[PDB]
């Protein structure tokens, strides 16, 4: 559909990765249909595509499913109404216009199935004759128009009840007016205060959200933090939240909107304020609340979006940080009365030692924890100690300090690593399985050892959305955060590769176009047949069909296999065109690989055909220079904590950490200990729009930065704290 196309190109525009045309979604769109994923787009469909990276395909995709739900249902709309003989050609006009759904369901209201509702039951008495005499006649008397309707067979057994029956006719009618719901909404939208008030008594109970307890700020502006407090606070009792603009006997203005729109003003006619009573009851019984329930709706949308945009960065971030490789680490999970749990694993990640120490508050059995720890990293030959970053991670961070101190010797290392989800992976069936006679509290530990080691092939053992990056994870829509999750998961996962006689079933089971059942099935036939010689025998492994080939091969590695190409992310579909490559300079393809010179001084345009464009022959000829290149920077951890890099040693890529030595109005300067400050630019400093630099920073602040550039004539370093930018 050219309309969606259109749309999501658009909106694709106005990211800062800047202008995508229609036919651009088109290609991709079609792509994704027939079952391509997005890292293989990215990677491999760069010529159909205009070069559309991951996050460009990521919010395509995420359109395209809005896009067609929304044009599904306007299309069931108009059979409907069409059905019902009300579909006017003005009507249909508007519904064509519609660009979102509430607009969509707004104009919708009037022909939607009705429910056994006051104004229904009232309608079936036949007081529809009534509402409609007293509103085109507001010179008649409401109690004496009443009589003739009266019938208690039929529910309405006096005029007083007879007139609250034609009064939730009109209520109805008013409320599902499309014109004037929009005009509320977009009003409301634009004047209403969100209003936080704490639910009397509660002061104690919700003492979390003692912020809110008399809140007050415009709606529509209110951000993602707060709004998601509120909602929280409100979810548990704690709150109360209203929309206020707007009985001091003050007409509200929306009274007054509702009002105009249906022509009523009230001129003391005998009818007029029974009408202002209905249009009073209007507002306070059915609008308002349907407005709040939209607007709040809204408001969560947007600050949940926020929300989960943030877990994605920082889960993409633990995903993509340097493994520590294999070297044998003591991995410590912090904790007070249930102690700090202790893993030792040796350099390919085997266990080899458990304990559980209380060094800590109440125990306090400091010496005797240092003995057990010293002990174990003696005996194991231990390098590194991993430390979980939750419950009393601190004083366990001081107390390997003192292990550290006390045993200089030993050269150990200590690093803080995150606990995201290493209790959920300790409960699970997985982890049941890889330590049946393990109990459960020592799982924890084990898992932060291994992520020290690596991050990646650790944490793809746990369910996504259950790697806890963030405050309210649990709260915000559950759907939202695994589409978002797992896509995070599947682009570091494709982004790296893996080596397919290695990688574990959990890992195999993100690459590109393969799950779990046929990662079982990799494991199970490398198993049974020893470890794979090329790509193509992936082939002969059951269910691993020529599509699923196609979308996992490139990112499947065999190293030291028949055929040298297979270690790269070259694809197979484009193996001949490499040996054409090969061909025209007369140098075989195992020459080629590792050339640098040589490769650098070809030109990719003598090699591009119908089919694989530039974009696809350049990417070749890096892989041939450096295959399967790990786009993970080096871990130098130890070197930066005893301060002996220098400016010299520094890669584009490196995340390090630094301290802020001055903030200007244009940026920060800040020392990652080469004895050369970095100049972070004011937007630089954050992932959100910045205005003031001394808003975020201060001297002295510890902040990650990433390395942006390296000069090394010149002396200088670039830097960000923004992990999403990319050096290049």
Same mark, same amino acid.
């Given at each position: 559909?050219?309309?969606?196309?259109? /749309?999501?190109?658009?909106?694709?525009?106005?990211l800062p990765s800047?202008?995508?045309?229609?036919?651009?979604?088109?290609?991709?769109?079609?792509?994704?249909?027939?079952?391509?994923?997005?890292?293989?787009?990215?990677?491999? /469909?760069?010529?159909?595509?205009?070069?559309?990276?991951?996050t460009?395909?990521?919010?395509?995709?995420?359109?395209?499913?809005?896009?067609?739900?929304?044009?599904?249902?306007?299309?069931?709309?108009?059979?409907?109404?069409?059905?019902?003989?009300?579909?006017?050609?003005?009507?249909?006009?508007?519904?064509?216009?519609?660009?979102?759904?509430?607009?969509?369901?707004?104009?919708?209201?009037?022909?939607?199935?009705?429910?056994?509702?006051?104004?229904?039951?009232?309608?079936?008495?036949?007081?529809?004759?009534?509402?409609?005499?007293?509103?085109?006649?507001?010179?008649?008397?409401?109690?004496?128009?009443?009589?003739?309707?009266?019938?208690?067979?039929?529910?309405?057994?006096?005029?007083?009840?007879?007139?609250?029956?034609?009064?939730?006719?009109?209520?109805?009618?008013?409320?599902?007016?499309?014109?004037?719901?929009?005009?509320?909404?977009?009003?409301?939208?634009?004047?209403?205060?969100?209003?936080?008030?704490?639910?009397?008594?509660?002061?104690?109970?919700?003492?979390?959200?003692?912020?809110?307890?008399?809140?007050?700020?415009?709606?529509?502006?209110?951000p993602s933090h707060?709004?998601?407090?509120?909602?929280?606070?409100?979810?548990?009792?704690?709150?109360?939240?209203?929309?206020?603009?707007?009985?001091?006997?003050?007409?509200?203005?929306?009274?007054?909107?509702?009002?105009?729109?249906?022509?009523?003003?009230?001129?003391?006619?005998?009818?007029?304020?029974?009408?202002?009573?209905?249009?009073?009851?209007?507002?306070?019984?059915?609008?308002?609340?349907?407005?709040?329930?939209?607007?709040?709706?809204?408001?969560?949308?947007?600050?949940?979006?926020e929300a989960?945009s943030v877990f994605a960065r920082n889960l993409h971030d633990l995903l993509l940080a340097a493994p520590a490789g294999?070297?044998?680490?003591?991995?410590?999970?912090?904790?007070?009365?249930?102690?700090?749990?202790?893993?030792?694993?040796?350099?390919?990640?085997?266990?080899?030692?458990?304990?559980?120490?209380?060094?800590?508050?109440?125990?306090?059995?400091?010496?005797?924890?240092?003995?057990?720890?010293?002990?174990?990293?003696?005996?194991?030959?231990?390098?590194l100690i991993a430390i979980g970053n939750?419950?009393?991670s601190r004083?366990?961070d001081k107390?390997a300090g003192?292990?550290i101190?006390?045993?200089?010797?030993?050269?150990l290392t200590k690093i803080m690593v995150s606990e995201a989800?290493?209790?959920?992976?300790?409960?699970?069936?997985?982890?049941?399985?890889?330590?049946?006679?393990?109990?459960?509290?020592?799982?924890?530990?084990?898992?932060?050892?291994?992520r020290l080691?690596?991050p990646l092939?650790?944490?793809?053992?746990?369910?996504?959305?259950?790697?806890?990056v963030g405050q309210?994870?649990?709260?915000?829509?559950?759907?939202?955060?695994?589409?978002?999750?797992?896509?995070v998961?599947?682009?570091c996962?494709?982004a790296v590769?893996?080596?397919?006689?290695?990688?574990?079933?959990?890992?195999?089971?993100?690459?590109?176009?393969?799950?779990?059942?046929?990662?079982?099935?990799?494991?199970?036939? /490398?198993?049974?047949?020893?470890?794979?010689?090329? /790509?193509?025998?992936?082939?002969?492994?059951?269910?691993?069909?020529?599509?699923?080939?196609?979308?996992?091969?490139?990112?499947?590695?065999?190293?030291?296999?028949?055929?040298?190409?297979?270690?790269?992310?070259?694809?197979?579909?484009?193996?001949?065109?490499?040996?054409?490559?090969?061909?025209?300079?007369?140098?075989?393809?195992?020459?080629?690989?590792?050339?640098?010179?040589?490769?650098?001084?070809?030109?990719?345009?003598?090699?591009?055909?119908?089919?694989?464009?530039?974009?696809?022959?350049?990417?070749?000829?890096?892989?041939?220079?450096?295959?399967?290149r790990d786009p993970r920077p080096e871990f130098k951890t130890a070197e930066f904590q005893e301060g002996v890099e220098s400016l010299k040693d520094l890669k584009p890529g490196m995340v390090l950490e630094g301290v802020v030595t001055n903030v200007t109005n244009f940026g920060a300067f800040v020392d990652i200990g080469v004895h050369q400050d970095g100049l972070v630019h004011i937007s630089a400093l954050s992932e959100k729009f910045v205005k003031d630099p001394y808003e975020v920073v201060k001297a002295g602040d510890i902040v990650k930065v990433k390395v942006m550039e390296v000069d090394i004539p010149r002396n200088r370093v670039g830097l960000s704290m923004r992990m999403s930018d990319t050096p290049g």
């Amino acid at each position: 559909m050219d309309s969606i196309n259109t /749309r999501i190109a658009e909106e694709l525009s106005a990211l800062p990765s800047g202008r995508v045309q229609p036919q651009q979604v088109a290609a991709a769109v079609a792509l994704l249909d027939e079952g391509s994923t997005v890292p293989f787009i990215a990677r491999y /469909r760069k010529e159909v595509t205009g070069s559309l990276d991951d996050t460009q395909l990521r919010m395509l995709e995420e359109r395209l499913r809005y896009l067609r739900e929304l044009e599904e249902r306007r299309g069931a709309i108009l059979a409907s109404i069409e059905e019902q003989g009300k579909l006017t050609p003005e009507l249909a006009r508007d519904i064509k216009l519609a660009d979102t759904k509430t607009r969509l369901e707004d104009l919708y209201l009037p022909y939607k199935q009705k429910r056994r509702t006051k104004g229904q039951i009232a309608l079936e008495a036949g007081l529809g004759a009534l509402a409609d005499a007293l509103f085109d006649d507001p010179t008649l008397v409401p109690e004496s128009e009443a009589a003739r309707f009266v019938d208690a067979e039929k529910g309405f057994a006096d005029v007083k009840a007879v007139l609250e029956g034609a009064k939730y006719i009109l209520m109805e009618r008013f409320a599902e007016d499309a014109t004037l719901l929009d005009k509320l909404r977009v009003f409301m939208k634009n004047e209403a205060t969100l209003t936080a008030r704490v639910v009397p008594g509660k002061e104690q109970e919700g003492a979390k959200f003692s912020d809110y307890f008399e809140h007050d700020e415009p709606l529509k502006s209110a951000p993602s933090h707060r709004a998601l407090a509120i909602f929280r606070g409100r979810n548990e009792g704690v709150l109360s939240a209203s929309l206020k603009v707007g009985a001091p006997g003050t007409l509200h203005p929306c009274e007054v909107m509702i009002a105009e729109r249906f022509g009523l003003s009230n001129q003391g006619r005998a009818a007029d304020k029974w009408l202002a009573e209905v249009v009073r009851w209007t507002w306070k019984v059915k609008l308002y609340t349907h407005l709040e329930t939209d607007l709040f709706g809204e408001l969560r949308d947007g600050a949940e979006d926020e929300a989960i945009s943030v877990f994605a960065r920082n889960l993409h971030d633990l995903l993509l940080a340097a493994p520590a490789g294999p070297r044998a680490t003591l991995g410590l999970d912090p904790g007070l009365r249930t102690g700090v749990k202790v893993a030792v694993v040796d350099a390919t990640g085997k266990l080899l030692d458990t304990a559980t120490v209380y060094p800590h508050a109440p125990k306090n059995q400091w010496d005797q924890t240092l003995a057990v720890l010293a002990a174990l990293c003696a005996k194991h030959q231990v390098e590194l100690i991993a430390i979980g970053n939750g419950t009393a991670s601190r004083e366990t961070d001081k107390l390997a300090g003192e292990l550290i101190k006390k045993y200089p010797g030993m050269k150990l290392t200590k690093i803080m690593v995150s606990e995201a989800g290493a209790s959920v992976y300790s409960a699970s069936e997985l982890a049941a399985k890889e330590f049946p006679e393990l109990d459960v509290s020592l799982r924890g530990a084990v898992s932060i050892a291994r992520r020290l080691q690596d991050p990646l092939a650790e944490l793809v053992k746990i369910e996504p959305k259950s790697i806890g990056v963030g405050q309210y994870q649990h709260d915000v829509s559950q759907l939202k955060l695994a589409r978002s999750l797992d896509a995070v998961v599947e682009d570091c996962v494709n982004a790296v590769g893996v080596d397919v006689n290695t990688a574990s079933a959990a890992l195999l089971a993100r690459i590109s176009g393969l799950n779990s059942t046929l990662a079982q099935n990799i494991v199970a036939h /490398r198993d049974a047949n020893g470890a794979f010689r090329t /790509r193509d025998e992936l082939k002969k492994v059951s269910r691993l069909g020529e599509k699923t080939f196609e979308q996992a091969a490139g990112f499947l590695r065999v190293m030291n296999g028949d055929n040298p190409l297979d270690a790269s992310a070259v694809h197979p579909e484009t193996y001949p065109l490499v040996q054409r490559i090969a061909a025209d300079t007369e140098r075989d393809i195992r020459s080629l690989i590792g050339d640098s010179a040589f490769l650098k001084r070809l030109d990719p345009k003598k090699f591009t055909d119908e089919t694989f464009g530039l974009p696809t022959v350049t990417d070749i000829l890096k892989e041939l220079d450096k295959p399967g290149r790990d786009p993970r920077p080096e871990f130098k951890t130890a070197e930066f904590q005893e301060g002996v890099e220098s400016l010299k040693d520094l890669k584009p890529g490196m995340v390090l950490e630094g301290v802020v030595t001055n903030v200007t109005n244009f940026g920060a300067f800040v020392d990652i200990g080469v004895h050369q400050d970095g100049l972070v630019h004011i937007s630089a400093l954050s992932e959100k729009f910045v205005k003031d630099p001394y808003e975020v920073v201060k001297a002295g602040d510890i902040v990650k930065v990433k390395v942006m550039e390296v000069d090394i004539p010149r002396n200088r370093v670039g830097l960000s704290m923004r992990m999403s930018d990319t050096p290049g």
